Design a protein around this ligand. Structure first.
Ligand SMILES: Cn1ncc(C(=O)N2CCC2)c1C(=O)Nc1ccn2nc(N3CCOCC3)nc2c1
Ligand SMILES: [Mg+2]
Ligand SMILES: [Zn+2]
Length: 313
């Protein structure tokens, strides 16, 4: 109960900032996560014995893929931590519990392949879940780990609080399906402008949490340029592997997945920042003003991709 996690001074300071990189020392990521749960949620939000066993089972269930890996899980949880800490009063105790765990679990057992590749391959998961295929898998995997003897970090919730947090986690994980983000942000955009946005309305709260999950999921575009640039390599390592596998099914990959279009990457990043990233952080900043630093970091990185195209780097 009196056992706090403590970080070194540079991490103690930088972990509070949106652009923090969790670093290359894997053995520190669990401790970083528990630190964030303790400060965001409380030191008695979870039984430390059960949390530690939950964290290590989650880690074991992420795979050795270039991008959709354990580092990504913890990276996405830290962006949620920074959103939650900069918005103290807006979120319930259950939401602060549920959302960090959602973020840690949101890509559980990812194979490095898109929902489209599973469908075209005709993978079993594509028969079990017709839409948001991997995301329904990720929630399934989260429930299974929670049901391992000794892994129920939620045991000392009431019956209804337990059903509520699992529903928060399910919606949060489904919402990381980028196919659903476009419609979600347009709805939130209309509501905010016409003034109908209402945070006591549960269906509105759900939408807001959806956007937060997208914002945390894409947070590589909100880091310092060298982190953004080097993460993009990991993203394309998966994309181009999927493109190879499409060619093996005798399907031409979309340009995103085609290693033969390395040359156009800087222009592909522009479209992604303009069509997805900037709109996401803009609407998030309008709803939660203290998340402005994410939008400013994203615009800085947009400007860096513009410099690469103009040959300046
Ligand atoms: C940075 N970041 N973070 C998350 C994702 C992402 O989409 N998700 C889905 C799972 C992670 C990306 C990303 O890079 N997206 C994209 C999206 C479209 N395009 N289109 C090209 N190009 C077309 C022309 O030819 C060159 C490539 N690159 C990209 C890169
Ligand atoms: Mg995902
Ligand atoms: Zn993800």
């Amino acid at each position: 109960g009196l056992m706090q996690f403590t970080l070194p001074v540079r991490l103690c300071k930088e972990i509070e900032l949106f652009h923090f990189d969790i670093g290359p020392f894997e053995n520190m990521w669990p401790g970083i996560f528990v630190y964030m749960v303790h400060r965001s949620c409380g030191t008695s939000c979870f039984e430390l014995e059960k949390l530690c066993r939950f964290i290590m089972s989650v880690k074991k269930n992420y795979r050795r893929v270039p991008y959709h890996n354990w580092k990504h899980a913890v990276t996405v949880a830290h962006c949620m931590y920074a959103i939650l800490q900069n918005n103290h009063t807006l979120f319930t105790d259950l939401e602060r519990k549920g959302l960090l765990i959602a973020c840690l679990c949101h890509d559980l057992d990812h194979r490095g392949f898109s929902n489209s590749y599973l469908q075209k391959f005709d993978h079993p998961l594509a028969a079990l879940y017709s839409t948001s295929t991997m995301e329904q898998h990720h929630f399934s995997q989260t429930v299974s780990i929670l049901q391992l003897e000794g892994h129920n970090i939620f045991s000392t919730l009431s019956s209804s609080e337990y059903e509520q947090v699992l529903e928060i986690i399910r919606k949060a994980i489904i919402a990381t399906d980028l196919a659903l983000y476009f419609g979600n942000r347009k709805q939130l955009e209309e509501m905010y402008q016409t003034g109908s946005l209402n945070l006591n309305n549960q269906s509105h709260r759900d939408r807001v949490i959806g956007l937060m999950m997208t914002a945390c999921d894409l947070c590589s575009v909100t880091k310092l340029w060298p982190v953004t640039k080097l993460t993009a390599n990991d993203i394309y390592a998966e994309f181009w592997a999927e493109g190879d596998e499409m060619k093996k099914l005798g399907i031409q990959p979309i340009p995103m997945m085609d290693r033969d279009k390395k040359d156009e990457v800087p222009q592909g990043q522009l479209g992604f920042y303009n069509a997805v990233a900037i709109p996401c952080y803009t609407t998030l900043t309008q709803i939660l003003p203290p998340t402005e630093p994410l939008l400013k970091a994203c615009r800085d990185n947009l400007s860096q991709w513009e410099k690469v195209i103009r040959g300046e780097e």
